[PDB]
Every structure is written in C-alpha cells, then in structure tokens.
C-alpha cells in the first residue's frame, strides 16, 4: 500500500542534535573571528613602555625588573639616610 509521508519531511533535525548548539555558537564566533588576538599588553609609555616590554611581557619573566624595582626604593631611603645623618 501507499507509502507514508515522513521521509520527505525534515524540520527538526536542526534542534535534534547537539552540534546545532555548537553550530550557532561557532557561526558567530567564527565568521567574526580575527586571525590573531589584539595584545599581550603594551601600554606604560613614557620611556617605560620599553621597561614593560623588556621585562613584563610574555617574552620573559626574569629577575631584572625585580632588581630594578628594588633599587628604586633603595635609592629613596639611601639618599634620605644622608638626609637623616
């Protein structure tokens, strides 16, 4: 007898599976995606964007800024020692 009409009806496979949710996510995310992100920090300029760039970038974490930062406070109180003495 005469075949039923379901095989030629589709209209809820688009909620029917899980990658639909991911699809509607990644059509927004990827379509308006940039090839590369914006920045790993770069502001501190006054001849100190260089200080941050050399020391406090993702390029390295090394003891050089620590030494520098320590020395600033040492220079304050060391001069003040002779202001107190």
């Amino acid at each position: 007898v005469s075949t039923l009409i379901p095989p030629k009806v589709v209209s809820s496979k688009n909620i029917g599976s899980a990658p639909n949710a991911k699809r509607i996510a990644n059509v927004v995310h990827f379509y308006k995606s940039l090839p590369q992100g914006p920045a790993p920090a770069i502001k501190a300029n006054t001849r100190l964007a260089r200080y941050k760039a050399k020391y406090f970038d993702g390029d390295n974490a090394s003891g050089k800024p620590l030494w520098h930062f320590a020395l600033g406070i040492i220079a304050f109180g060391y001069s003040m020692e002779y202001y107190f003495h």
Binding site: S2, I5, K8, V9, V10, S11
Partner: protein, 58 residues
Amino acid sequence: RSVLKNTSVIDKIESYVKQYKPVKIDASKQLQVIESFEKHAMTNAKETESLVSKELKD
C-alpha cells in the same frame, strides 16, 4: 468439445463465456489519488531537499 459427444452445452457455456467476456471492466482509480498524493509529497520533498542542501553549504 470434440471430446464431448453430448455437445449441446459446450455451445451454451461457450456462448455464456463469450457473453460475459468483459467479466470485469477496466479500472484506473489511481489518477485522482495519485496526483493529490504527488502534490503533498512533492511539496514536502522539495522543502526537505532545499533545506538540507542549504545547511550543507552553510
């Protein structure tokens, strides 16, 4: 018939058979139901086809 020697009934049933020879007449009844069915089916078929093709390229 040439087997039967009492033949006056073979001419009878021959004539009865040839009388009622369109024993059952022609039928094509699938021509109103088949076309209507084809419209609903076609509509749905094309809709599904276009939908999934569209999704593929998307």
